[PDB]
């Protein structure tokens, strides 16, 4: 609190896990701010809302394997300071944009940004906290930050919008990411290259591992369901009228209030109940709650099941993001940078190819008829988590 | 080579004051805290305080507050840390440290280089 | 004040045996504990850091482990030159405390 505690005290290895948390909850809250802004800006009206979940989840799903390689050989304080770096251009970029191509752009070079910040600062939490249940309580609370982004971005974004115009929710938004870089140059070094001490296991032989694959899975199919149900939704299709400004800014409450809830419980009781149990138990809950989100009459029936599912999600993740670093240490090479660009692939792919696969099937059969099939196949595939109970080792 | 070296021997009177020095060499001075710890003949070491040459900022051990004040020489790139009203119960080992940042960071994980001791001796 | 607690101030092993140093904190200190050796006649140099991690030059008989409150430092192969004082650290709160120390001798 005191600016001179700060200046008088050993720097306590809490203030990497502070620049984690805080650059995921900008890239979340930048992510988000646009909501009550693009109906707005506007193929099908849930066809160019498809564009903007797809375009910035591609992008950052292509550039996660070369920050994976490039922490190896630079270190980590470079691609974390460079996610600042294009998160600023990013919201100015926004802020001055009078189109939909504009905005796709903005969405692209935001993913970039996001991509370096997420891959650079989850595999750095891990270097740094290398004891197993330490690792688990800081990457719990760093992803707490993503829900809390996603709570906070809507409502702000839309308060501003009305009140004060149109570029004003991301003209405080600059100050902000200013704010996070002036932090991270306090802490880190990011003008010194440094190379890791080893050479880590190659791409295409953790990719091989079967025990990668799974905890990998696990995160990729958990967001599966929920990645196909927001490009689709009503309240994208009505303009900004017509008690339209409610439904875009309290959307996505019920889902980030849980993912924060789930997240904050189970990084911590994730290590008294096996991560196992959390990733089986957290693959059912979805599994139920997407196969209940069919027998919604009207929008409000989307509240309890989007609470359900985002509490689960939450679970998978903080049980998962973990476990890649302990395998990682167990079986192979201990150097973090392209264990978790896998994690992020997968966590990342769902809303990659979702507005697109999910909105071809649900033409082929049917929207109930595709919630159906991704319930039941998360259900399926939560079994193969038991295979984390006890892995081999080296 | 980083290097911090310090008085063989101090030898003070059952009432006086003594300065003693570690000087620093082979690296930047103002960028790296100096810790001081003082170790009785068959005891434990116990903290004294910190203090950031740049800016002299300095911290103390609570039951040191009044005992030893830490102060810095950037010109000539000195520590010094000045104990006063010595008597005995003083007549221990004193070491000056310096504190390292962890590998592109600024988080201290451990203290690198010690100073050879003084052994400061109180008797009339 | 955390009080690190080293049970034991004289510890005896013969050479190629496995010894371990046990230190144990008061409050909760989280993998913020430091293991230290410092050889006859010499200023201490560092072993373990974040009570896991190795420092650069140390051997790879030295290892670094945490039970709760309970560090341990465990030497494997104890050589001639493994003899020497050894002691803890933490920097959670700000009062530095150091473990009381162990000293290593030879059994005959």
């Known amino acids: 609190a005191l600016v001179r505690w700060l200046q008088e005290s050993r720097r306590s290895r809490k203030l990497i896990l502070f620049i984690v948390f805080l650059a995921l909850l900008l890239d979340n809250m930048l992510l988000t701010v646009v909501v009550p802004i693009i109906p707005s800006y506007l193929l099908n009206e849930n066809v160019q809302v498809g564009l903007l979940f797809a375009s910035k989840a591609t992008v950052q799903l292509i550039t996660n394997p070369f920050i994976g390689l490039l922490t190896n050989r630079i270190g980590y304080p470079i691609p974390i300071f460079a996610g600042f770096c294009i998160m600023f251009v990013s919201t100015i970029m926004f802020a001055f944009s009078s189109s939909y191509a504009f905005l796709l752009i903005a969405r692209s070079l935001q993913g970039i940004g996001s991509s370096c910040s997420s891959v650079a600062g989850m595999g750095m939490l891990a270097s740094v906290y290398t004891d197993d249940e330490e690792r688990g309580n800081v990457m719990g609370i760093a992803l707490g930050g993503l829900a809390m982004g996603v709570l906070v971005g809507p409502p702000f974004g839309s308060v501003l919008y009305e009140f004060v115009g149109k570029t004003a929710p991301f003209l405080v938004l600059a100050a902000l990411v200013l704010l996070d870089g002036a932090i991270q140059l306090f802490v880190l070094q990011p003008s010194r290259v440094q190379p890791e001490s080893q050479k880590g296991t190659p791409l295409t032989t953790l990719l091989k591992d079967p025990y990668i694959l799974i905890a990998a899975g696990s995160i990729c199919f958990a967001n599966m369901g929920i990645a196909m149900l927001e490009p689709a939704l009503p309240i994208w299709m009505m303009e900004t009228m017509c008690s339209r400004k409610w439904q875009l800014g309290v959307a996505f409450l019920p889902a980030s209030i849980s993912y924060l809830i789930g997240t904050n419980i189970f990084g911590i009781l994730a290590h008294k109940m096996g991560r196992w149990l959390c990733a089986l138990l957290g693959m059912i809950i979805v599994g139920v709650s997407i196969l209940c989100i069919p027998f919604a009459k009207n929008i409000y029936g989307l509240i309890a099941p989007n609470f359900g599912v985002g509490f689960a999600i939450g679970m998978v993740d903080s049980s998962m993001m973990p476990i890649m670093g302990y395998l990682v240490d167990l079986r192979h090479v201990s150097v973090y940078g392209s264990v978790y660009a896998i994690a992020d692939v997968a966590f990342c792919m769902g809303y990659a190819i979702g507005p697109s696969a999910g909105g071809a099937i649900a033409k082929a059969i049917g929207f109930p008829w595709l919630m159906t099939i991704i319930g039941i196949i998360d259900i399926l595939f939560a079994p193969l988590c038991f295979f984390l109970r006890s892995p081999p080792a080296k | 080579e980083v290097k911090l070296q310090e008085s063989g021997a101090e030898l003070v009177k059952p009432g006086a004051s003594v300065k003693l020095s570690c000087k620093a060499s082979?690296?930047?001075?103002?960028?790296?805290?100096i810790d001081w710890v003082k170790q009785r003949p068959g005891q434990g070491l116990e903290w004294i305080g910190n203090?950031?040459?740049?800016?002299?900022?300095?911290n103390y051990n609570e039951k040191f507050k009044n005992k030893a004040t830490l102060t810095v020489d950037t010109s000539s790139s000195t520590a010094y840390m000045q104990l006063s009203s010595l008597t005995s119960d003083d007549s221990a080992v004193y070491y000056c440290?310096?504190?390292?940042?962890?590998?592109?960071?600024?988080?201290?994980?451990?203290?690198?280089?010690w100073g050879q001791g003084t052994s400061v001796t109180v008797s009339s | 004040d955390i009080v690190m607690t080293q049970s034991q101030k004289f510890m005896s092993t013969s050479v190629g045996d496995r010894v371990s140093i046990t230190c144990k904190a008061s409050?909760?200190?989280?993998?913020?504990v430091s293991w230290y050796q410092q050889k006859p006649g010499k200023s201490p140099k560092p072993l373990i850091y974040?009570?896991?991690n190795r420092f650069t030059g140390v051997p790879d008989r030295f290892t670094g482990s945490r039970s709760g409150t309970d560090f341990t430092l465990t030497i494997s192969n104890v050589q001639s030159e493994d003899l020497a004082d050894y002691f803890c650290?933490?920097?959670?709160?700000?009062?530095?405390?150091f473990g009381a120390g162990t000293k290593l001798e030879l059994k005959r």
């Open positions: 440290a310096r504190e390292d940042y962890y590998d592109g960071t600024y988080v201290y994980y451990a203290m690198d280089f």
């Open positions: 082979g690296y930047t001075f103002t960028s790296y805290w």
């Open positions: 203090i950031y040459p740049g800016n002299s900022s300095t």
């Open positions: 409050q909760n200190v989280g993998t913020d």
């Open positions: 974040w009570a896991s």
């Open positions: 650290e933490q920097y959670s709160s700000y009062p530095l405390t």
